[PDB]
Amino acid sequence: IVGGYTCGANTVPYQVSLNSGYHFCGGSLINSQWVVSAAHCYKSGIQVRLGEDNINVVEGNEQFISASKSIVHPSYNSNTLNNDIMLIKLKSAASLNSRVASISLPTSCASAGTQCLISGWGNTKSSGTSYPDVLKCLKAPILSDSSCKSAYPGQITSNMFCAGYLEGGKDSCQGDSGGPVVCSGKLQGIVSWGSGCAQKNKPGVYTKVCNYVSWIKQTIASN
Ligand SMILES: [Ca+2]
């Protein structure tokens, strides 16, 4: 997260880190046994880390649980990042409490101008690289589909939305991928892509979660 703030330990209780010996992506806990992330985050051998603040120090609220299975969206296109969504099942249910908690799926698609909370352990620099050890947070509005398409001609599908600031300075970044965009207490986006981070006229592009609620619910019900 570029141009964000330190969230505070366990203030984003649905935020998970995906670990394969190291943090590589974020995710969102949507019930005691399932995580939503970005399909471009797929790999084998995932350990889900819940209850994290400092991802390099054991602070006392962690739960580390290996994934039993991953399900990439059946229409994921890695070239276009259309349908950049995957589900990860935990081998055992997490223990839920105020510091480790699921986030609800949306009932409604959020609109342009709605304020959302974007969070992650990704790069905090637009130029060069600095990884934080603690969770970073950013409040950002959803942008109009017209401003989104104008920023990224030929690239924005009906399964994407832009959020952030056309002026630059404030954005998600590398290492935030798969993490949450939460608006009015519901998971509306997944950190997906952007051209660099926090560059002018290159806002963040997010998977549009409201399009996937039927697929998520049906997939969980049978797996
Ligand atoms: Ca920790």
* Residue 154 shares a structural domain with residue 189: yes
Same structural domain, 148 and 97? no
Q: Which residues are catalytic?
A: 40, 84, 177
Distance 149 CA to ligand 1 centre (A): 38
Residues of the domain holding 41: 13-102+211-222
Ligand 1: distance of its center to the CA of 142 in Å? 30
The experimental resolution of this structure, in angstroms, equals 1.4
Residues 95 and 120 grouped into a single domain? no
Ligand 1 centroid to 139 CA: how many Å? 23
When divided into structural domains, the chain yields a total of 2
Tell me whether residue 54 is annotated as binding: yes
Task: Please give the full DSSP string across the chain, using - where no structure is assigned.
Answer: -BS-EE--TTSSTTEEEEESSSEEEEEEEEETTEEEE-GGG--SS-EEEES-SSTTS--S--EEEEEEEEEE-TT-BTTTTBT--EEEEESS----SSSS---BPPSSPPPTT-EEEEEESS---SSS----SS-EEEEEEBPPHHHHHHHSTTT--TTEEEES-TT-S-B--TT-TT-EEEETTEEEEEEEE-SSSSBTTB-EEEEEGGGGHHHHHHHHHT-
